Design a protein around this ligand. Structure first.
Ligand SMILES: [Cl-]
Length: 357
């Protein structure tokens, strides 16, 4: 991978159509669009997410555990790799799979309540502390690896845990065997243990992704690159690892690419403060030598609204943000999501700040 990295992060939900001939045309237009953009890399959705409900029930590749909505991941991937001139990372959930209900789910401990529960507004994650979960998610990644050729894996941002998670019984067991108390409330009120517990959860998640990476590499070979999405807060306010279980230095040591969700509006930043926020993000990154050379900053191309809808970020604003990143010494970047159906973002408007050529 010769620098700079310039990433289009692409959902296939848009490309899918019940009409095979329409889906044909959609794929052709998408292939041409990526070709015309002239960038280095596509992060390509391997799972279906038609409702954005935080749980994957269907995927775009044949496999042993979940329905295949349409066999299109490999079809799009090989054409992007040969015709559009890009590396492809298979974008996969780490935890949020609609598998066997007897599999342990991540739970949180509600204030004033005895029994752990599933947090309503979080990804519907399986617990990485359940060995059956590790095996089954492993099978999904092996099925992907066996049925499609690609250049990398992008691990989804659903590999996170809050400061009241994971409260499930297998997680509790894991903490106890690691030397912590079985009571989350107790851990949370101990200065040293709370710090250590956050770190433990971060490593647990990272280790799980590395197990999955090894499984993929066993099949496709060791040349496969790894990337993982990290939330902005663990980068800019590292103490936030306490409620994300993500650690930036850990990502930098563990993956080829750390894909930072550099998305001010997602983080509640006022429109007029977005430049300052992006600049401060780049500043924090440069506190770690070579971090920028191992990080991709993913800008948002949509603004996601409270009531479930989203609207486009203007292409001119996206281009300005890209200009800003370059001027602050950040050369590796991209955006999410892409919408070929409406040429959003507008190829002609963003290419001068985006394209490698
Ligand atoms: Cl449980």
């Amino acid at each position: 991978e010769k620098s700079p990295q310039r990433i289009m992060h692409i959902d296939l939900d848009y490309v899918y159509d019940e009409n095979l001939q329409q889906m044909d045309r959609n794929i052709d237009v998408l292939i041409q669009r990526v070709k015309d953009m002239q960038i280095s890399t596509v992060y390509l959705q391997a799972f279906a997410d038609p409702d954005g409900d935080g749980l994957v029930k269907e995927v775009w590749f044949p496999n042993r555990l979940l329905p295949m909505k349409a066999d299109i991941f490999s079809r799009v991937a090989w054409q992007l790799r040969t015709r559009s001139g890009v590396n492809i990372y298979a974008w996969m959930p780490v935890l949020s799979w609609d598998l066997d209900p007897t599999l342990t789910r991540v739970k949180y401990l509600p204030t004033g309540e005895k029994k752990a529960q599933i947090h309503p507004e979080q990804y519907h994650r399986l617990s990485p502390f359940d060995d059956r979960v590790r095996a089954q998610v492993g099978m999904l990644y092996e099925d992907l690896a066996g049925h499609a050729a690609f250049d990398g894996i992008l691990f989804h941002d659903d590999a996170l845990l809050s400061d009241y998670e994971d409260a499930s019984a297998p997680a509790i067991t894991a903490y106890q065997q690691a030397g912590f108390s079985g009571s989350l409330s107790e851990i949370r009120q101990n200065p040293e243990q709370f710090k250590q517990w956050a770190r433990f959860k971060s490593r647990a998640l990272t280790d799980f992704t590395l197990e999955l990476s090894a499984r993929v590499k066993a099949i496709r070979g060791p040349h496969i690159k790894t990337a993982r999405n990290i939330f902005a807060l663990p980068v800019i306010q590292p103490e936030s690892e306490a409620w994300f279980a993500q650690n930036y230095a850990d990502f930098l040591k563990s993956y080829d690419w750390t894909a930072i969700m550099a998305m001010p509006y997602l983080e509640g930043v006022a429109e007029k403060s977005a430049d300052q926020w992006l600049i401060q993000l780049t500043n924090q990154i440069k506190n770690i030598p070579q971090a920028k050379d191992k990080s991709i900053l993913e800008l948002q191309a949509q603004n996601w609204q409270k009531n479930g809808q989203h609207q486009a970020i203007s292409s001119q604003q996206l281009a300005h943000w890209m200009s800003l990143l370059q001027l602050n010494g950040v050369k590796n970047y991209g955006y999410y999501p892409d919408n070929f159906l409406h040429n959003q973002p507008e190829i002609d408007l963003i290419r001068p700040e985006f394209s490698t050529a």
